[PDB]
Amino acid sequence: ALYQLITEKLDYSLKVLQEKFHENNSMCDELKRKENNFKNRLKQLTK
Amino acid sequence: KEETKNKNLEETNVMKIILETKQTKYYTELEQMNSKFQSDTSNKVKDHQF
């Protein structure tokens, strides 16, 4: 009983954590694009 | 005096080995189940960690 339920809990937790990792990667690259856009906006503004 | 020891030891050993055969019949799953948990759970643990 300790075995099967805990192993299924962990198998579901793997998906739970991988979802948040993928979404964190998406938020990270969107942050990268945002900061690049702000820096290029500054570039054009100075020009 | 000899016969007392003879009968005691003989019956005692007969019962001991017979009940030993009866008893030794019960355990196969404890260590195997534990190990077969951790064997396929180590990768999950490493996933959790990383």
Side-chain angles (χ1 to χ4, degrees):
Chain A
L2 276 60
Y3 161 97
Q4 194 169 350
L5 274 298
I6 73 179
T7 187
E8 59 87 19
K9 253 191 166 182
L10 289 169
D11 78 16
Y12 172 76
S13 294
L14 180 58
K15 299 289 94 176
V16 174
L17 199 58
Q18 282 173 330
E19 284 172 356
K20 65 173 70 67
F21 189 42
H22 206 198
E23 296 147 10
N24 285 136
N25 276 343
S26 302
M27 161 205 278
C28 188
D29 65 359
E30 63 87 20
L31 282 166
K32 304 312 321 203
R33 70 166 287 274
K34 277 191 176 180
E35 201 178 9
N36 286 120
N37 291 335
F38 275 109
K39 267 72 180 173
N40 286 337
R41 188 162 156 174
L42 185 152
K43 291 174 184 170
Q44 277 187 5
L45 297 176
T46 81
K47 268 187 182 178
Chain B
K1 183 69 68 176
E2 168 199 13
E3 82 195 11
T4 310
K5 271 284 199 286
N6 290 319
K7 66 176 73 175
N8 280 350
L9 65 92
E10 284 161 8
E11 288 159 354
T12 299
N13 271 335
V14 178
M15 91 195 308
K16 209 152 187 182
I17 296 89
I18 294 171
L19 289 160
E20 282 151 345
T21 310
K22 291 198 285 285
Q23 184 167 173
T24 312
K25 170 195 163 186
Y26 289 160
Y27 70 95
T28 308
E29 70 280 27
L30 173 144
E31 214 165 7
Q32 270 186 352
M33 192 295 308
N34 191 15
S35 67
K36 61 94 173 180
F37 181 76
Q38 285 92 22
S39 44
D40 60 9
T41 309
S42 62
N43 51 39
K44 306 177 184 182
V45 174
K46 302 309 152 267
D47 283 331
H48 187 277
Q49 308 167 180
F50 160 72

